[PDB]
Design a protein around this ligand. Structure first.
Ligand SMILES: [Mg+2]
Ligand SMILES: [Mg+2]
Lengths: 383, 380
C-alpha cells in the first residue's frame, strides 16, 4: 500500500539519549544528606562490609542489580555489529528487567571478542553485581564463556539467548501435555539439534520427567549402538533407548512432538506419520523449521514458534525476569537446572483454560509466579 | 568527635539496599510500548548505530552515563579493603553526579589489582560509557592507571582523587588573588606534600601561570640540585628555582601562599614569618594542618579548609560533577589541564567580587556554570 515500519520511533532514542537512567533512592539534596550518603558516614558502611563481605548483599546495590553483558557479536537478527550498536538492545533488555520484575539491570557492552579475556572481564566485575545475564554473544564462544563463568563465578550467570526460550518451550509442553491427556513419561519426544543447545533442552527434558527422548543431528538419529557418533557419548546413554538407526523422517514415526533448531528441516508430509495429536515447536529464528499454518494442514494439533505473527509464540520475556528475581531474592550463588524447570512450571501455572493459548501473556502476576517457583524449588538444602 | 553518628545514623543502605536504582526514561507497560523500546523496533536503532558510530553518543545512554570505577584498594581513609566494601563509596560518588550535575553514573568495582588487567578492563567497557571516573585506587599504581587511560581511551578518563580537590583549591586562589590584587606570577607559593594531590596542585598552578612554587615533603624542600629519582617532567626541575633547599619552616619566609595536603603541622608562629597578607589552605582532615581559628589570630589574611565547619570550605563536589557534565556535553576524548583550569575559573566566577568568602557553595546550576566553562574551552 505504502509501508514504512511505523516502529521508526528511532526518535525515541534521539530524544532521551538512551532509555535508561540512574536515580538515587536516598536523600541527597543537602550537606546533611551528603554526610550520610557519602564522605563522612559512608565510611562505616564500607567498614562493616570489610569485616563481613556477606553484608554486600544487604548494604549495596549488589542486592538487586544484574548486569546485561554482550560483545555485540550476535545482536538480535542482525550480526556482529559491535558493542556500541548493541547498547540499544542491552538497555532495552534492562528496561524489561525492571518493568516486569523489580530487577535493576545495567547494560554493558565490551569490545573484545577474545573468549579468554571476556570471561576474565566479567569475573572481575562479578563483585559489583548480584547477577550476570550474558546476551547476544555468538556461538560457539557463547557456550564456553557461560560454562567457565558459571563454574568460576560466585554469582548466578545465565546466557539468556539459549536457556531462555528453552524454559519457555519446556513450559509450553507442560501445558501441551495437559490438553492431550498424556504424561511426560508416556511421551515420545524428538529433538532436532546435536549442538549444545539441543543437548541442554534434552537434559532439561529428562530432568523434567521425560522418559523417551531421541536426539537428532545433521547426520541422523543419535543411536547408542552405533559408535559412529561424535564425542558428545553421554546423551546416547540416556536417550533413544530403542536404538532406532534411521533419519529425522524416520523419527516422527509415532512421536508425540518435536522440539527443533534447523531451518525448514521438517517437511509437512511427515507430520502425517507422527503420533495422534502431534505438537511441534519450530524454534528456528527467522525461517522456522516449518511455518505453523503450513504444519496445521498436515495434521498437527499444536504449533509454536518464536514468531509474533503466528499463535503460540515462545518468547524469552516470560522467563528471564522471574528467574533472576527469584535467584536474587534467594541470594543464589548460581542458577540450577531444577530452578529452571521450576520457572517452567510457574510459567505453566498462568494458563487457566488452554487451547491455542498454552503460554501465558504478560499479566500482573507473571514474574512473581515465576520467581515464586524459582525460590522454594531450592527445596534441597545441603545440610 | 564521636559525633560521626551519621555513619550509623544512616544505614539507609539496609533500608534501601544500596543507594542507587535503574529507571527507564521511556514507556513500557503496553505491548505496543515494548514493540518500540525493544523488538523489533529497537532493531532500527542498532542498525543505524552500526552504520554510524558517532550515533552512539546520540541514541544510547552513553550520551550521559559515566562509570565510577575502583579496585577497592584505597577507599576513603580505610586503605585496601576490597571491591565489595568499596561499593558503598562508589554508590555515593555516583549519586553525587546525578544530584549536582545531570550526569548518570554507574558504580563498578573490580576483583583484581594487576595494573594491566585494570587498564584493559576499562578499555573493554568504555564503549558503554561516555566518561570514566577512577576513584579510590592507590598509588603508585593509580598513576600508571590514569596516565595510560588518558592516552589510550576514546572517552575521557579521570581520577578525581588526585586532581579534584586540586582544582577547587585553584578556584580558591584565583579569587584570593583578587582581594590581594597580585598576579599569580608575583606570588610566592609553598606546597606541603609531595604526594599525588600535592603534585596535581603544583602542576595546575604552573599551567595557570605560577612562576614561584616550591614543594616540601617528608624531608624538606624539594631541591632540583639535591633530588634523585628512580627513572628521571619531574617536579624537581619545575620548582624551587632559587635552588634553595632547607626546612619546611625555613621556606615559608615571606611566602604569600601555602597549600597543605595531609599532615597537621603548620605552627601559628610561622605566619608572621610569611608575607604581609598570607593565605592558608589547610586541606588535611579530619585534622587540618591548622585550624582557621589560630590562623586568623596569628595574622593570616585568608583561610580555607576541607571543613564545612568553617568559612571557605574547599570541597570536591564543586569540581567533578561539572567537569564531566561538560566533557560529555561537548563529547571530549580527554580531560585536559586546560579543561581543569577552565573548571576552576568557572567555579571562582560563581562568587561575584568576593570577600573572605573566596568560594561558592552549591546554589542552582553550579555544575552548569562549570560545565559551560569546560565545554566551549575544548571547542578550539
Ligand atoms: Mg538476545
Ligand atoms: Mg576517594
Amino acid at each position: 500500500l505504502k509501508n514504512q515500519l511505523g516502529q521508526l520511533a528511532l526518535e525515541q532514542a534521539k530524544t532521551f539519549g538512551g532509555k535508561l537512567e540512574v536515580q538515587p533512592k536516598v536523600d541527597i539534596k543537602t550537606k546533611h544528606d551528603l554526610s550520610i550518603a557519602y564522605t563522612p558516614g559512608v565510611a562505616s558502611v564500607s567498614s562493616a562490609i570489610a569485616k563481613d563481605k556477606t553484608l554486600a548483599y544487604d548494604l549495596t546495590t549488589k542486592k538487586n542489580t544484574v548486569a546485561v553483558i554482550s560483545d555485540g557479536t550476535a545482536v538480535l537478527g542482525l550480526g556482529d555489529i559491535g558493542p556500541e550498536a548493541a547498547m540499544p538492545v542491552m538497555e532495552g533488555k534492562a528496561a524489561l528487567f525492571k518493568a516486569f520484575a523489580g530487577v535493576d539491570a545495567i547494560p554493558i557492552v565490551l569490545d573484545t571478542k577474545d573468549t579468554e579475556e571476556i570471561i576474565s572481564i566479567v569475573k572481575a566485575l562479578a563483585p559489583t553485581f548480584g547477577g550476570i545475564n550474558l546476551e547476544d554473544i555468538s556461538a560457539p564462544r557463547c557456550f564456553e564463556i557461560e560454562q567457565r563463568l558459571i563454574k568460576e563465578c560466585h554469582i548466578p550467570v545465565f546466557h539468556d539467548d539459549q536457556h531462555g526460550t528453552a524454559i519457555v518451550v519446556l513450559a509450553a509442553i507442560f501445558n501441551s501435555l495437559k490438553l492431550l491427556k498424556k504424561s511426560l513419561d508416556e511421551v515420545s519426544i524428538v529433538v532436532n539439534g546435536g549442538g549444545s543447545a539441543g543437548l541442554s533442552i534434552t537434559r532439561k527434558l529428562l530432568a523434567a520427567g521425560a522418559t523417551k527422548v531421541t536426539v537428532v543431528d545433521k547426520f541422523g538419529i543419535i543411536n547408542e549402538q552405533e559408535a559412529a557418533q561424535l564425542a558428545p557419548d553421554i546423551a546416547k546413554v540416556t536417550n533413544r533407548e530403542f536404538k532406532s538407526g534411521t533419519l529425522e523422517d524416520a523419527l516422527e514415526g509415532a512421536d508425540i512432538f518435536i522440539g527443533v533448531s534447523a531451518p525448514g528441516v521438517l517437511k509437512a508430509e511427515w507430520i502425517s506419520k507422527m503420533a495422534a495429536r502431534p505438537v511441534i515447536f519450530a524454534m528456528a529464528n527467522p525461517i522456522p523449521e516449518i511455518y505453523p499454518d503450513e504444519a496445521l494442514e498436515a495434521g498437527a494439533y499444536i504449533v509454536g514458534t518464536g514468531r509474533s505473527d503466528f499463535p503460540n509464540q515462545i518468547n524469552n520475556v516470560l522467563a528471564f525476569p522471574g528467574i533472576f528475581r527469584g535467584a536474587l531474592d534467594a541470594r543464589a550463588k548460581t542458577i540450577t537446572v531444577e530452578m529452571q524447570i521450576a520457572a517452567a512450571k510457574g510459567i505453566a501455572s498462568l494458563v487457566p483454560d488452554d487451547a491455542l493459548s498454552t503460554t501465558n501473556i504478560i499479566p500482573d502476576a507473571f514474574k512473581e509466579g515465576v520467581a515464586e517457583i524459582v525460590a522454594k524449588s531450592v527445596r534441597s538444602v545441603v545440610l
